[PDB]
Amino acid sequence: GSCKGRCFELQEVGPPDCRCDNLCKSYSSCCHDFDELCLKTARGWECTKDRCGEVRNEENACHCSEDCLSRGDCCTNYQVVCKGESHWVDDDCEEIKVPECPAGFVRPPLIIFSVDGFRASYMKKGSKVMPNIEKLRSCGTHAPYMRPVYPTKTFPNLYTLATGLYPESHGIVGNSMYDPVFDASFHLRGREKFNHRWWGGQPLWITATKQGVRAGTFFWSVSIPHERRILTILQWLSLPDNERPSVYAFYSEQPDFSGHKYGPFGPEMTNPLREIDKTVGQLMDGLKQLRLHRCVNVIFVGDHGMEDVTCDRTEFLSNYLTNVDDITLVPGTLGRIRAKSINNSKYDPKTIIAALTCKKPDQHFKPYMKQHLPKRLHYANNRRIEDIHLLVDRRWHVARKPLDCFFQGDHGFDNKVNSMQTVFVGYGPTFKYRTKVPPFENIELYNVMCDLLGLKPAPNNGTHGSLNHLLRTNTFRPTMPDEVSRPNYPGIMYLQSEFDLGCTCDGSTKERHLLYGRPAVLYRTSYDILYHTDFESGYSEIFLMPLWTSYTISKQAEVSSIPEHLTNCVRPDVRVSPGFSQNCLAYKNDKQMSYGFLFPPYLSSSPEAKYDAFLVTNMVPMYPAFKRVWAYFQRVLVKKYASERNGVNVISGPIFDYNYDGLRDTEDEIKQYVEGSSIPVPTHYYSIITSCLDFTQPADKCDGPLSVSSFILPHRPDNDESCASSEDESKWVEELMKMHTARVRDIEHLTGLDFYRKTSRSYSEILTLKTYLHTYE
Numbered sequence: 001g002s003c004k005g006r007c008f009e010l011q012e013v014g015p016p017d018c019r020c021d022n023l024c025k026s027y028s029s030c031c032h033d034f035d036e037l038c039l040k041t042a043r044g045w046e047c048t049k050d051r052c053g054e055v056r057n058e059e060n061a062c063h064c065s066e067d068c069l070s071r072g073d074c075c076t077n078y079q080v081v082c083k084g085e086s087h088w089v090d091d092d093c094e095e096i097k098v099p100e101c102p103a104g105f106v107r108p109p110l111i112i113f114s115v116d117g118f119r120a121s122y123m124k125k126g127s128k129v130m131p132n133i134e135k136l137r138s139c140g141t142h143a144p145y146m147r148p149v150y151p152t153k154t155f156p157n158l159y160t161l162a163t164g165l166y167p168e169s170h171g172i173v174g175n176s177m178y179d180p181v182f183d184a185s186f187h188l189r190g191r192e193k194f195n196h197r198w199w200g201g202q203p204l205w206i207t208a209t210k211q212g213v214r215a216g217t218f219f220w221s222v223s224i225p226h227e228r229r230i231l232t233i234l235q236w237l238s239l240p241d242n243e244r245p246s247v248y249a250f251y252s253e254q255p256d257f258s259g260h261k262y263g264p265f266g267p268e269m270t271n272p273l274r275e276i277d278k279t280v281g282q283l284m285d286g287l288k289q290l291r292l293h294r295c296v297n298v299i300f301v302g303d304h305g306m307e308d309v310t311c312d313r314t315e316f317l318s319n320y321l322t323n324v325d326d327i328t329l330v331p332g333t334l335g336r337i338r339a340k341s342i343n344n345s346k347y348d349p350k351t352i353i354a355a356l357t358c359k360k361p362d363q364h365f366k367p368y369m370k371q372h373l374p375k376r377l378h379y380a381n382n383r384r385i386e387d388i389h390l391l392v393d394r395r396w397h398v399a400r401k402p403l404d405c406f407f408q409g410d411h412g413f414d415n416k417v418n419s420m421q422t423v424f425v426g427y428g429p430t431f432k433y434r435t436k437v438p439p440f441e442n443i444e445l446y447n448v449m450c451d452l453l454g455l456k457p458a459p460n461n462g463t464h465g466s467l468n469h470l471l472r473t474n475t476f477r478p479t480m481p482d483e484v485s486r487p488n489y490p491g492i493m494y495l496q497s498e499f500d501l502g503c504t505c506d507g508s509t510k511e512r513h514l515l516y517g518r519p520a521v522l523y524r525t526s527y528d529i530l531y532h533t534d535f536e537s538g539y540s541e542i543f544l545m546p547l548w549t550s551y552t553i554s555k556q557a558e559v560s561s562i563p564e565h566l567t568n569c570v571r572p573d574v575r576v577s578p579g580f581s582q583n584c585l586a587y588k589n590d591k592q593m594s595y596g597f598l599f600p601p602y603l604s605s606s607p608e609a610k611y612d613a614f615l616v617t618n619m620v621p622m623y624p625a626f627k628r629v630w631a632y633f634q635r636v637l638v639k640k641y642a643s644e645r646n647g648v649n650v651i652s653g654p655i656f657d658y659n660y661d662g663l664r665d666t667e668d669e670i671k672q673y674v675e676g677s678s679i680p681v682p683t684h685y686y687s688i689i690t691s692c693l694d695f696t697q698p699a700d701k702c703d704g705p706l707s708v709s710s711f712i713l714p715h716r717p718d719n720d721e722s723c724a725s726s727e728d729e730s731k732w733v734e735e736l737m738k739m740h741t742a743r744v745r746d747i748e749h750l751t752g753l754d755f756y757r758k759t760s761r762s763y764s765e766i767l768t769l770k771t772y773l774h775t776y777e
């Protein structure tokens with residue numbers, strides 16, 4: 001029938017009856033008089049001097065009458081223009097030590113002010129362009145930037161913000177995507193996106209509602225202007241106790257649009273940024289009118305940044321592939337390739353990758369099978385992610401052919417790129433005051449938003465506790481996980497004559513080489529701790545190799561060669577059974593597989609100590625192509641890092657992730673072995689390299705904060721990824737490593753290990769350390 005007294009209901013009323021909620025427009029379900037009653041424009045969105053104390057005219061957009069405050073339907077500037085109040089922006093900064101809410105409020109409400117395409121570096125423009133945002137940032141808690149998820153597109157990131165999940169888990173892997181089981185495509189434009197089957201996880205509003213916390217908004221019909229959205233939130237905040245939501249969301253599509261048209265550094269970006277600020281001011285003036293400006297927690301968050309990208313900087317797949325009419329390409333700042341028709345017999349991923357690899361000197365993209373993408377991107381474990389992927393260089397596009405500028409800016413690139421970085425500000429009672437915090441990942445906010453609302457988060461990819469330092473009052477205290485498998489400490493048991501492995505050759509440990517305690521194994525397994533002069537390891541009897549190998553290299557330690565009488569030296573480990581050892585005959589028979597060592601023989605403390613490096617229990621399967629990467633790391637780079645960081649602690653080991661879910665594989669999940677043998681082949685090799693943040697203190701006597709960098713190098717039988725691999729390792733290996741930079745937390749998921757158990761630092765601080773990522777930007 002009609003929307004009278006029902007404009008912006010917090011309920012979708014039962015079909016077939018017409019709706020009056022904030023989404024009715026999106027479902028073509030509004031009553032005939034929704035536009036008339038609920039979308040009033042008359043006399044704008046701002047009170048004027050002459051309108052003060054007017055008689056209520058029902059048809060005004062917002063009101064300047066005496067009864068307006070009683071209702072909560074004044075314009076946002078009413079008190080400023082009429083009652084002589086100041087704009088929120090013009091008031092001094094003042095610490096909110098507790099929530100100052102009206103009587104009935106049970107929790108501080110949370111409002112999420114999300115902005116699209118908002119680049120981290122826009123905040124440098126400051127008070128001159130955005131005085132309201134600059135106040136929020138300065139007065140509350142802010143980071144220099146926040147890292148989005150890849151791909152750095154709107155919908156993957158927005159739903160990542162809502163769920164705490166990587167796109168591969170929540171299932172919104174792109175703005176555009178195709179699902180082979182559904183046989184349907186998802187797009188901005190279409191009915192398909194209205195089907196719940198695309199949207200996985202548990203967004204914050206569902207978490208809120210499941211636990212009796214009432215949840216507003218989030219998605220808004222695009223036809224509803226910005227000012228009306230702000231007024232509706234303010235109207236909802238004036239509802240009675242039993243009806244009023246404790247969580248709201250506003251979304252601005254700016255400054256993405258102007259970013260796309262004019263580029264990120266274009267002078268045309270100012271008015272759009274002023275427009276955002278104005279909307280923020282309307283919210284804050286509004287809150288201050290309702291006496292909620294020191295009650296509500298406000299998060300000002302972006303989804304990703306914006307880069308200079310013109311259509312003249314485009315790569316065409318038709319310049320590489322002979323039959324581009326046989327494929328479908330998801331184009332732009334990334335690439336996803338798939339067969340055009342499923343029933344094409346000629347289609348073949350191998351030939352396509354071959355044809356797109358290192359062909360032109362300047363080539364501005366790189367092809368990957370999805371499993372070989374840097375593990376830090378976490379973009380592979382979903383049937384909607386095409387097997388073939390193209391990582392496009394910043395500032396460039398990839399298209400299928402020339403007949404596939406109207407745009408000077410775009411985004412979507414690798415989430416470590418500077419231009420893709422975006423904003424975070426937290427303002428309110430629960431956030432800290434005048435506080436700067438380090439950059440962090442948008443996957444972490446869901447937990448924080450649960451904490452601000454007193455909700456138990458659903459399982460997600462944030463590390464709960466890692467952002468406790470953003471908050472005045474922490475409702476979550478993290479605790480270390482319990483160790484599952486106790487290590488064994490095997491003595492000297494077996495004779496050398498008891499081994500027919502086909503191999504030929506010629507105490508203080510713990511406090512020196514495990515600076516941060518023994519890693520805890522968080523699954524059922526059988527492993528041995530092995531002590532040596534120069535290194536300690538947790539040797540697996542199932543996988544026949546170390547789970548981890550830990551050692552410390554001071555700034556003044558020497559790099560010695562491998563003497564060539566020990567070139568093929570592998571020694572049986574007296575402390576481990578032949579039945580739980582590797583054998584060298586497998587390596588001999590396996591024509592594609594050589595081997596390497598986790599503790600480097602190159603950094604041995606003495607000649608006698610160097611022999612411990614050639615034990616069968618320090619040995620790990622390596623492809624000759626990969627041995628170029630690993631040998632350059634161990635020989636040159638680890639010393640380099642010790643010198644520059646005043647010593648370094650290094651924990652190295654294998655990872656098995658054949659089903660590319662970013663999680664530790666079980667035995668069955670291993671799909672490759674050294675031939676005719678039970679030696680499992682790792683998919684990647686990690687290292688965690690720790691030192692004292694204060695570089696003046698050595699690594700082994702650090703009284704302050706720690707400094708970490710890590711990687712997860714893929715274990716590849718070629719170096720096709722590195723187009724300069726024909727050249728010397730100084731030209732290419734370090735770039736390859738930087739691209740596969742990782743967080744310690746990535747390694748823990750992939751290994752089922754837990755590091756940094758014995759430190760003199762709080763566990764929240766350690767959780768922050770584990771989520772850190774060295775980006776090399």
Ligand SMILES: *[C@@H]1O[C@H](CO)[C@@H](O[C@@H]2O[C@H](CO)[C@@H](O[C@@H]3O[C@H](CO[C@H]4O[C@H](CO[C@H]5O[C@H](CO)[C@@H](O)[C@H](O)[C@@H]5O[C@H]5O[C@H](CO)[C@@H](O)[C@H](O)[C@@H]5O)[C@@H](O)[C@H](O[C@H]5O[C@H](CO)[C@@H](O)[C@H](O)[C@@H]5O[C@H]5O[C@H](CO)[C@@H](O)[C@H](O)[C@@H]5O)[C@@H]4O)[C@@H](O)[C@H](O[C@H]4O[C@H](CO)[C@@H](O)[C@H](O)[C@@H]4O)[C@@H]3O)[C@H](O)[C@H]2NC(C)=O)[C@H](O)[C@H]1NC(C)=O
Pocket residue numbers: 165166168169170171197198199200201202210378381382383458459460461661662663749
């Ligand atoms: C990032 O964080 C993620 C979440 O913690 C991690 O992802 C999880 O990984 C685990 C381990 O592989 C996986 O577990 C499997 O689940 C199988 C059942 O799958 C269906 O149900 C689950 C659970 O339902 C609910 O719980 C989630 C939290 O995970 C919540 O977000 C949901 O809203 C839902 O909530 C409701 O229930 C809870 C619990 O009672 C209540 O608290 C709450 O109030 C709600 O009422 C769903 O998560 C699954 O979702 C997938 O599938 C749908 C439909 O296709 C997709 O739309 C969705 O996007 C998602 O798809 C992704 O995951 C699947 C695999 O699960 C991938 O194949 C796909 O490519 C996507 O990545 C399903 O609806 C279960 O059968 C299975 O059991 C087997 O293993 C166990 C041992 O573990 C054995 O005992 C058995 O023998 C089985 O062999 C297994 O338990 C989770 O499903 C998955 N969760 C999510 C959300 O992704 C991720 O690993 C982590 N990443 C990193 C790098 O750390």
Ligand SMILES: C[C@H](CCC(=O)NCCNC(=O)OCc1cc(Cl)cc(Cl)c1)[C@H]1CC[C@H]2[C@@H]3[C@@H](O)C[C@@H]4C[C@H](O)CC[C@]4(C)[C@H]3CC[C@]12C
Pocket residue numbers: 023026112114158159161162193194195196199203218219220221222249250251
């Ligand atoms: C996709 C479509 C909305 C169209 C659009 O572009 N709207 C822009 C405004 N967006 C907005 O305000 O979002 C705020 C926001 C902020 C943050 Cl930080 C994070 C997020 Cl995720 C969002 C909408 C309209 C209706 C939506 C469906 C809904 O009606 C029913 C389901 C609800 C469920 O929780 C998810 C799946 C749905 C099918 C919704 C999918 C998206 C729809 C179609």
Ligand SMILES: [Ca+2]
Pocket residue numbers: 656657658659660661662663664665669
């Ligand atoms: Ca796995």
Ligand code: NA
Pocket residue numbers: 587588589590591592593594
């Ligand atoms: Na070999």
Ligand SMILES: [Zn+2]
Pocket residue numbers: 116117153154155256303304
């Ligand atoms: Zn966006």
Ligand SMILES: [Zn+2]
Pocket residue numbers: 117154256257260411
């Ligand atoms: Zn955009």
